[PDB]
Amino acid sequence: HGYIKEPVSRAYMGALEKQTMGWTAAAQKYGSVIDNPQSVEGPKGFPAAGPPDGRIASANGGSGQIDFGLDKQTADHWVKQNIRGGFNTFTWHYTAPHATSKWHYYITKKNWNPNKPLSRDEFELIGTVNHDGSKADTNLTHKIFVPTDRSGYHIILGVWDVADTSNAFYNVIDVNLT
Ligand SMILES: [Cu+2]
Incomplete structure (x- = not known):
């Protein structure tokens, strides 16, 4: 269990907005993930397997740990944070x-549709961090090159594959790319 803290994942943004807007208003916006941003857990093997299209952001309800709130997708719903093209941590x-x-990172394609549910064919692989089966916290931060050929609203998906289970943690990040 864990989540992307910087940039602030959508899941962790829900936990953050719990504090600023309260439990009910934040749960209306994000669903039950506000309490458990670490629990966006679904089957590993993305993109060939893993959570189905339209259930990527919620990891198909996080193995029963959360609801499907995160799967809403419109241009306006989610809080965007600024990031620059090029290397980012x-x-x-x-x-x-x-x-x-392993961890594996994707971004939305240049022509993606911010008002339809997320599908795996809207995402492009941008980097893979292999790991030696040790604990995740031996490599907390990853240096990933974000494409420099697109701008405006994009989603970075970070995926964390667990070595000794059939599961993985899916963290979408809403970004305004410049
Ligand atoms: Cu866990």
């Missing part, structure tokens, strides 16, 4: 740092 916080096989 992605830092996870672990509540329970499991043995890790």
Whole structure:
């Protein structure tokens, strides 16, 4: 269990807006993930397997841990944070740092549709961090090159594959890319 803390994942943004807008208004916006941003857990093997299209952001309800709130997708719904093209760092916080096989990072394609549910064919692989089966917290932060050929509203998906289970944690990040 864990989530992307910087940039602020959508899941962690829900936990953050819990504090600023309260439990009910934040749960209306994000669903039950506000309490458990670390629990966006679904089957590993993305993109060939893993959570189905339209259930990527919620990891198909996080293995029963959350609802499907995160799967809403419109131009306006989610809080965007600014990021620049090029090298960026992605830092996870672990509540329970499991043995890790890899992390893998994707961005939305230049022509993606911000008002339809997320599908795996809107995402492009941008980097893979292999790991030696040790705990996730031996490599907290990853240096990933974000494409410099697109701008405006994009989603970075970070995926954390657990070494010793059939599961993975899916963290979408809403970004305004410049
Ligand atoms: Cu866990």
